[PDB]
Structures are given as C-alpha cells and as structure tokens.
C-alpha cells in the first residue's frame, strides 16, 4: 500500500513532469514495442509502430491520461481503474507480465527526461504506485 509519504512523493513528482506527459507516453510506448517486441502483437492493428509514429504517439498520450487518472485516484486505485481493468484484464487478456514491462519503460523515460527529479526515493514511491496501478489493472482477470 502507498503511505502518505509515498503519495506525497508521487504527487510532487507528477507535478513536475506532467507538462511533458505526451512525450513521456510516446517514448514509453515506443520503448515497450521495440525493446520488448513480444508486446507488438497487442497493437498489430496499427501498421506503423516505429518509435514516434502517429499511432504510437497518440496512444502514448492515452496511456499517460490513464496514469494521470491513477494519480487523481491514488487513494483507491482499484476502484479508480476498474473500467480500464475490464478492458485490459478481461477483454484484451493482456498478460500481466506486460504491465511490469510498461511500468519499467515509464520509469526509464522519466529517469531519462527528469534525472534530477527522479531520486532513489522518488523511484521507490513511483514504483510502488505503478505496482498498485498494475494490480488495479489486474482486478478483472479472474
């Protein structure tokens, strides 16, 4: 669970990086597809999946809108992300290993873009947060 310390840390970090959310989402999604190509088949209905391609850029923004929703719903991620869970865990049957992969790519991109803000303390709180997001997305598997 997220302590108040963790929530404060995530909110402060988000306050510093949210203006860059479109770019974060495009880079993160681009890296999941090329660094972990097993995920490409989830998006095969879009023909150009190169880094920064129109569909990747657009969906990157969508993903980060889901992260901003999670920050607003940080006191109850499971309730907050229920619809997103029904889509990912039940309708799309995304393998939960892939939630870990996208979470890792988000942390790599935030570390790359905001090295001074992404301290070891910010890292452990945001990883606890992304673990909480991933578990919330896993709510409707079974």
């Amino acid at each position: 669970s997220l302590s108040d310390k963790d929530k404060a840390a995530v909110k402060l970090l988000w306050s510093k990086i949210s203006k860059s959310s479109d770019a974060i989402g495009n880079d993160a999604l681009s890296r999941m597809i090329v660094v972990y190509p097993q995920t490409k088949t989830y998006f095969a209905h879009w023909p150009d999946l190169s880094p920064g391609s129109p569909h990747v850029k657009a969906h990157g923004k969508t993903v980060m809108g889901g992260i901003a929703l999670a920050v607003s719903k940080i006191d109850d991620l499971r309730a907050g992300l229920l619809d997103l869970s029904e889509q990912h865990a039940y309708k799309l049957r995304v393998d939960p290993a892939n939630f870990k992969i996208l979470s890792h790519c988000i942390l790599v991109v935030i570390s790359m873009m905001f090295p001074k803000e992404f301290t070891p303390e910010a890292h452990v709180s945001l990883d606890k947060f992304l673990s909480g997001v991933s578990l919330a997305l896993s709510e409707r598997y079974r």
Binding site: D27, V35, P51
Partner: protein
C-alpha cells in the same frame, strides 16, 4: 546469440561512455532500495537501514563498481558470455542462493540509472540493444542454477 557490427558498437559506446565509479554504486544502491529483500544477500556490507544509509555506504558502492567491471568482461567478449559468467553463476547460486528473478531487477535498475546518465542518446533502439545484451547476461548468470 548472434550480434551485428552495429549492436557491438552500440554496447561498446554505452559502457565506454560511463564512469563506472559513478554508475556502479547508483545501480546497486537503487536495487537495494527499490527491491529491499535483496539486502538479505549483503549481510557483511554494513548499514542498509534506509536509502540515505545505502547511498552513503562505501562497501556497497565498491561492490557496484565491481559489478560494472564484471559486465565489462561481457562487453569485451560478447560471443563468450555464457562461458565467462559460469563461475559467477555458481557464486550467486551456491554462496548466496539468490533467486534468479532478482538478476532482472538489478539489470532494470542499471537501465534506469544509465538512462538518466545518458539522456536522449539512450534512444529506443539503443535501449533495445542494451536489453538484449543484459538478457544474455542474466541468462548466463542463471545457467548454473
């Protein structure tokens, strides 16, 4: 694992550009903080009480530097990685009994600290080659398990 000339150059450039004395302690400190059960394997290394302690711990720092020099061995022999880490695999299995899942976690921490150091030059294709290399290394480290 086969490698192209460009993959070899990319791995050489990523590691060639790093200060192992800076990156090693950060990568290992972050693993001990973010995945703190890994502290169970560092019982002779001093204070691991909290993030400040770990980051200030010079025994941990020196060990992180040793890890990067160990990776350097694979950088300089990219076709012989399974062979070159056979002894290290035994070390991690038989002395420490470390679950191989944790090798991926230290590699992930390394990638995060490299990304912060390298900036946008750590582009997605560069990360893909680096993860490929780290996967070969992690597979070589669990082989003797």
């Amino acid at each position: 694992v086969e490698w192209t000339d460009q993959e070899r150059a990319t791995i050489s450039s990523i590691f060639g550009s790093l200060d192992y004395d800076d990156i090693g302690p950060k990568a290992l400190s972050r693993c001990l903080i973010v995945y703190p059960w890994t502290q169970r394997h560092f019982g002779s290394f001093g204070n691991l009480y909290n993030a400040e302690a770990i980051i200030g711990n010079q025994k941990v720092a020196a060990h992180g530097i040793k890890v990067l020099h160990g990776l350097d061995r694979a950088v300089k022999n990219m076709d012989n990685i399974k062979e070159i880490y056979a002894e290290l695999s035994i070390l991690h299995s038989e002395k420490l009994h470390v679950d191989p899942d944790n090798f991926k976690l230290l590699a992930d921490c390394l990638t995060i600290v490299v990304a912060a150091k390298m900036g946008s030059g750590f582009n997605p294709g560069t990360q893909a080659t680096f993860q490929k290399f780290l996967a070969v290394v992690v597979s070589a480290l669990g082989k003797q398990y």
